């Protein structure tokens, strides 16, 4: 799993540049969005929301001196635009979802994610320890939304569409 990652026009996906939609192929309906989870007053959980279209766009990032990403690189994922420069995706325990994908201002120099080919598209895989196997990101359907969350079961599969 070391291939260049391609968008839906067949072009390499950029490192630390451009903006992309993650367009569902498996299950899941809607655009990327932030949602409240549990008893948090401000929305920080990353979701697909059938009623936010087009929804948010993301940027992939690694400090490696290269202009594109591959399935072998460990990445930060962030919204573009994001409310602060340090804001990135991360995974943490969040009731009642599980190991939810949420936004945080704590950013590691090298991120914990890889984008790996799966089926018709790509999935995200989260690595709490880089010397060990990762946990796929799948979806938890709740509150008419699809919460991104680590899973042992079916991953969320998407194609990568470059934005305007």
UniProtKB/Swiss-Prot annotation:
GO molecular function, one term: cysteine-type endopeptidase inhibitor activity
Any matching Pfam family: Kunitz_legume
Keywords associated with the record: Protease inhibitor, Secreted, Thiol protease inhibitor
InterPro entries on file: Kunitz_inhibitor_STI-like_sf, Prot_inh_Kunz-lg
Record flagged with keyword Secreted: yes
Location of this chain's protein in the cell: Secreted
GO annotations of cellular component type: extracellular region
Family: Belongs to the protease inhibitor I3 (leguminous Kunitz-type inhibitor) family.
Function: Inhibits T.cruzi cruzipain.
Protein name, as recorded: Kunitz-type proteinase inhibitor BbCI
Source organism: Bauhinia bauhinioides
């Amino acid at each position: 799993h070391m291939s260049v990652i391609l968008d839906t026009k067949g072009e390499p996906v950029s490192n630390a540049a451009d903006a992309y939609y993650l367009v569902p192929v498996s299950h899941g309906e809607g655009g990327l969005a932030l949602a409240k989870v549990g008893n948090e007053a401000e929305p920080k959980a990353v979701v697909l929301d059938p009623h936010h279209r087009p929804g948010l766009t993301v940027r992939f990032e690694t400090p490696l001196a290269i202009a594109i990403i591959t399935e072998s690189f460990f990445l930060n994922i962030k919204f573009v635009p994001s409310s602060s420069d340090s804001e990135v995706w991360d995974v943490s325990k969040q009731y009642p979802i599980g190991l939810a994908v949420k936004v945080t201002d704590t950013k590691s120099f090298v991120g914990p994610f890889r984008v790996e080919k799966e089926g018709e598209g790509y999935k995200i895989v989260y690595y709490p320890d880089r010397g060990q196997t990762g946990l796929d990101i799948g979806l938890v359907h709740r509150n008419d939304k699809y919460y991104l969350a680590a899973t042992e079961g079916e991953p969320f599969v998407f194609k990568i569409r470059k934005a305007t």
